[PDB]
Structures are given as structure tokens and as C-alpha cells.
Design an enzyme around this catalytic site. Sequence first.
Site, PDB file in Angstrom:
ATOM      1  N   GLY A 128     165.229  79.522   3.576  1.00 33.36           N
ATOM      2  CA  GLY A 128     166.143  80.009   2.566  1.00 33.36           C
ATOM      3  C   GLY A 128     166.418  78.893   1.571  1.00 33.36           C
ATOM      4  O   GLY A 128     165.591  78.625   0.696  1.00 33.36           O
ATOM      5  N   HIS A 152     152.756  80.932   0.919  1.00 34.51           N
ATOM      6  CA  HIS A 152     153.932  80.237   1.429  1.00 34.51           C
ATOM      7  C   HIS A 152     154.283  80.509   2.888  1.00 34.51           C
ATOM      8  O   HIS A 152     154.592  79.588   3.657  1.00 34.51           O
ATOM      9  CB  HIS A 152     155.130  80.612   0.561  1.00 34.51           C
ATOM     10  CG  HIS A 152     156.409  79.951   0.964  1.00 34.51           C
ATOM     11  ND1 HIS A 152     156.546  78.582   1.048  1.00 34.51           N
ATOM     12  CD2 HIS A 152     157.621  80.471   1.277  1.00 34.51           C
ATOM     13  CE1 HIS A 152     157.786  78.288   1.402  1.00 34.51           C
ATOM     14  NE2 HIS A 152     158.457  79.422   1.550  1.00 34.51           N
ATOM     15  N   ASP A 200     150.437  78.272  -1.766  1.00 39.08           N
ATOM     16  CA  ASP A 200     151.889  78.425  -1.651  1.00 39.08           C
ATOM     17  C   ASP A 200     152.507  78.379  -3.055  1.00 39.08           C
ATOM     18  O   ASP A 200     152.528  77.326  -3.698  1.00 39.08           O
ATOM     19  CB  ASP A 200     152.473  77.303  -0.768  1.00 39.08           C
ATOM     20  CG  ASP A 200     153.952  77.508  -0.436  1.00 39.08           C
ATOM     21  OD1 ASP A 200     154.698  78.161  -1.219  1.00 39.08           O
ATOM     22  OD2 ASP A 200     154.386  77.006   0.630  1.00 39.08           O
ATOM     23  N   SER A 211     159.700  75.495   4.849  1.00 37.73           N
ATOM     24  CA  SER A 211     160.389  75.741   3.576  1.00 37.73           C
ATOM     25  C   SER A 211     161.743  75.012   3.537  1.00 37.73           C
ATOM     26  O   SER A 211     161.802  73.790   3.707  1.00 37.73           O
ATOM     27  CB  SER A 211     160.527  77.248   3.324  1.00 37.73           C
ATOM     28  OG  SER A 211     160.942  77.537   1.995  1.00 37.73           O
ATOM     29  N   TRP A 212     162.832  75.738   3.325  1.00 35.68           N
ATOM     30  CA  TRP A 212     164.135  75.088   3.408  1.00 35.68           C
ATOM     31  C   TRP A 212     164.317  74.483   4.807  1.00 35.68           C
ATOM     32  O   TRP A 212     164.990  73.456   4.979  1.00 35.68           O
ATOM     33  CB  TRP A 212     165.275  76.046   3.106  1.00 35.68           C
ATOM     34  CG  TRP A 212     166.560  75.503   3.674  1.00 35.68           C
ATOM     35  CD1 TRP A 212     167.204  75.920   4.809  1.00 35.68           C
ATOM     36  CD2 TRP A 212     167.330  74.400   3.156  1.00 35.68           C
ATOM     37  NE1 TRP A 212     168.328  75.161   5.015  1.00 35.68           N
ATOM     38  CE2 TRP A 212     168.434  74.223   4.017  1.00 35.68           C
ATOM     39  CE3 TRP A 212     167.191  73.550   2.049  1.00 35.68           C
ATOM     40  CZ2 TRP A 212     169.401  73.226   3.805  1.00 35.68           C
ATOM     41  CZ3 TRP A 212     168.151  72.567   1.832  1.00 35.68           C
ATOM     42  CH2 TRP A 212     169.245  72.413   2.712  1.00 35.68           C
TER      43      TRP A 212
END
Lengths: 318, 319
Positions: free
Chosen positions: A42, A296, A268, A110-111
Site C-alpha cells: 500500500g 508489479h 513493474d 512494494s510498500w
Amino acid sequence: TSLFAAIQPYKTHLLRVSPLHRLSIKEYGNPQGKPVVFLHGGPGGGASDSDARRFNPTTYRIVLFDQRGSGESTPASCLEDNTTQALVEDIEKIREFLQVGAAWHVFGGSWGSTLALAYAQAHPARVKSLTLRGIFTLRKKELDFFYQGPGSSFVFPEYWEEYLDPIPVAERGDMVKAYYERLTGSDEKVRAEAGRAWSRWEMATSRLHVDPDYISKADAPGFADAFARIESHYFVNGGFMPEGELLKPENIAKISHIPAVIVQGRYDMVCPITTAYELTKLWPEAKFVVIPDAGHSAIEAGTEKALVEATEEFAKLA
Amino acid sequence: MTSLFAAIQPYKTHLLRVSPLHRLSIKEYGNPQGKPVVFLHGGPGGGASDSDARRFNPTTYRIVLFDQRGSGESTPASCLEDNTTQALVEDIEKIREFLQVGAAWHVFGGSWGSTLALAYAQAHPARVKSLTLRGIFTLRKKELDFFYQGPGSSFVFPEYWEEYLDPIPVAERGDMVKAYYERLTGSDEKVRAEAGRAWSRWEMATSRLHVDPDYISKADAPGFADAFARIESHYFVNGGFMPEGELLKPENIAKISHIPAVIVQGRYDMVCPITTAYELTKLWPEAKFVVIPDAGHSAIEAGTEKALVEATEEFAKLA
């Protein structure tokens, strides 16, 4: 599939971490296994049972939790005292509360890789290993490439148009701020409309092939509101870190000895490979795995396989 | 397993003088009695090859290939004098008449070839039976900046981006195209060769979904690399000798809106990103749009190639 069987948790918890926030924690697999903590992305995306499927249930004590304001953690969509530093401290509060021991494996994409890196740099002794995917360090150029343009806008122009739509042209100079102000404004319709559009942009651009099942998640207001509010919150604030903080040599040196794998999709379009690549230059000890036909998402075929290979191998760590 | 027709050699080759300076190599393949089609190679400055004749049915088409000024076998090699879009446009006409192909012909072009195709069709719409276009490129500033300047393709191929930045001192990095052009046209030969290789490599490395070492090695051929880079940089630094966005202006799109057309575009084209093709489809809905979900830039990407042959096959029905 290289995923282990679908699995339900053997224990769930609610842990108070502030006078405001309360984290939902779920444990899966073997209570006697090697402890591993999963950091969802996120930010504000929350974790799900499926994320437990990347770890051998016999080998690992699998700890999942939803970071502040996301998933089942309360209060939903709360932006008060929701910072990187707080989340970093939360992982420690969880570690002690679950009595996992002195250290554990860390898994993030990711986050999730942003939080993993921040966590490891702040508490390198607590980390047995780092399995990282879709590297994201919230640098301005990173956020500008995805939310501002030109960047991913050129590869998904039809969705880019949708994403620009809710924002008056005069405000288009700073998309993140324009979105944040609507996502935190008092008008509920615009806040919902903005949450959907913001979320949709990412869902539409997260895999090599556009997945309609990914896209429909933006149409879930429960998810979309917290997802967008928290993302825009952190992004407009640079993840509450100086520019390039995670990539500074003095910080990379704190974690250079930690066994690590970076798994990165070549295509990505949410977190482009340049960041991962740059990390590998600063951190050659780390194992680099590029997936030539993956975007991604963690569920891209090649990415997923490499991820499970990582957890399998890391389980050999004493 | 391919939709390509058999490898094929030309039945006739020509050398046609088009200026006091320039001289174009023209090669005809297939059926002399077939439907005339002209192939426009990309780059600019890339030249054509026998393999490009393989996208057309040899029984159905009179296949006309040629190398645009200064490229391929056309002379003088790597010559930037009087090498402009308008000159190339007029050259296609000089070829048309010389080969006595008739009043009109099909046109096929990808990348810079789609640029030339669009310029040609807009300047001589009566001469064009159909348009088969791939990897749409209209030389707008944002298009060239996305690939040569950054940020853009630089983020998806960072390791090659670094190689590409390397020959240019950092104080000159504000305009990559001009910095390259000046080296590619400078008097120091080593620098010119070095720049030609690096410039060419960047494009070869970024032209397909999977990085193809056989594509990459082409930059190590100085013959190819010198003309390829010099001519590319020549046009790019000059905006293709057209006003910004000239090809996409409505009044120009209107000149070709009736011309049967297919745009075939790779979703992950990192040389000429899909936004340009997409924008063209908005201005030109008559045109058939075909997006390939797992293809980069090149015509030989599996899905692109298949769609291209389907286009020539269908366009061969045109009376």
C-alpha cells in the site's frame, strides 16, 4: 503453483499500540516454526490469508498483521499518528507481544519493502533475513513517475486518463496533493470518487496483463477508502523520511550483512526497476532476481515462484 | 512456427539518383504483377533488409523495398546533407514513378517508418491504398524526451540507461540528443564511433520484451551504428523537420482518415510508448487498433508480427 495450500490462522489477536490504534494480528502454520513477519503493501492495503501461502506451514511460524488503519486494524482509514516511524515501532511491539524471540525473518513487497528496509535499518539485530519485491523507497522521482507523469502514464494512457479525470486541470500540477485533499475533505462523494479512481489506477497497472479481478477491488469502497487515504497520506509526506533516506550508504551499511533477496519485475509500472537496481548497486551482498515478463504484483508467475524459493532457502538459516 | 512467408531474394535491384548527392538502393521482391506495396524501414537511418520482404505474400504483392537517404546500401553512407523528412517524402514519389508501379500503392511502416508513412500519406493521400502501421512515432518532444532524456524508459532499463549516459559529461546531460549529435558529427573519430555504438545499443537493448543479445550485438557493427545513430540524432535534434505535433493535428489526420489502416502497437513498447498510438486512435477512430499485451517495440515480437501479416493479407483484398 508454488504456493502452499490455502490456510487459515490458528490464532488471531488484537493488540493495542497507541491510545488510538489497534492492530489485528493473525498467526498461521507451525507455532514451533521459524518466526517470520509479513509486511503488506500500500501502504494501507492490509494483509490477507493468501499472503500466508508463501511460507512452508510446517517450517514457519507465520505472522501476518494489518498496519494502522488498514484491513481489520482499527480505527479504519485513520490518518492520525499514522507514520513510518510508528509502523516501525509497531513491528517491534508485535514481536515482543507474540514472544517470537529475539529475531525473525521479514517479508515485504512494494510498500512492504519500504517498511522492511526502514525496520531493518532501525533494528538490524531483529532481522534474520529480508525477502523483498517491487522495491519502493518513496523518493520524489519514484512517486512522480507513477502519480504525476510522465512515466507509467505513457504505458497505460487509457487508465491515466481516468486517473486525471477527477482533478481540475489547474490542480494537475501536483496530483498527489490534489488527491489527498479530496481524500481527506468533508464532501463524502468526492472522497469516495477519489478513493476509487486513485485505487483503480494502481490496480490497472499492477500486472503485465490487465486483470479485471484486480481492477474490481477499487470498486470496493471499504478497501478503496483506506487504501487511497493512507497511500496519499504517506506519499504526500514523502513517507515521513528525508529524500532518499533508505538508499543512503550509511543506512545500507546497517543491513548489508542481512541475508537478502530482491525479486523485481522488469515491467513493474508501479515501482519501476531502477529503484531495485540502484539498491543492488549499494547492496551487492543481496541476491538480485529480475523477472523478465512480470509487472508489479507478487502473484506474477515468475515473481511468485522466486518468492517461495526465497522463503524455502531462508528457512535454512539457524 | 511463424506467420512469415519464406525467406526471399529480390528479382530486381536498382540504384536511383534522387539528388546531385543522394542515390537510393531499391529492391523488388515477389510478383512483378502483384499489388504494389512500399516498405518504409525505421530508424531513421536503419535501412531495409531482405527479411522485411517476408511480411507480404510473394504471390499477391509486388514488394518494393528501399533504403532511405544515407542508410543501408544507399549512397552516400551516413550523409546528413539534404537528409530531411520532406526529402524522404519526395523520394517515395520518385521511386513510385520510376518503378512505374501505377497511380497508388499500399504503404507499410513501423517506428520511424510509421512517421514517414504518416508524412507521406498526408502529403500524397491519393497515392496510398492502405496503411499498415506499427510502434507509432511522431517525433514530439515528449516522445523523444521519454526515450533519450528521461525520466521515461530509463526507469524500466536502468542498467542500459547508465551505459547510455556514460559518454556524456554530466554538465551536458541536460540535452542528451544534442550532446550525442555533436559527437556524432564531430571531427574526433573515436568519440564519434563510441557515441554511435552507445546510442545504438540503448535502442537495441530496449526494443523487445525480453532483452535479445542478437539485437544488442548490432550496435557493435560500426557500419550500421554510425549511420543509424547519425541519422537518428540528425532528425531527432531537428524535431523531424516538422512543427511540434504536426502529424497529429486534426487538419492533417483529416487528409488520411479515409485511408484503410491498421495500427499495431506493443503495450510494453519502451522505444515508442503506446500513448502516441493511443492518441492517434482517438483522432483517427476509422483506423483499426491492435494492442499486443506482451510485446515491446520490435516488429518481430510474436504477437506484433502475426498481426502485421494479418494486415497485409487483408489489405491485399483492396481493389
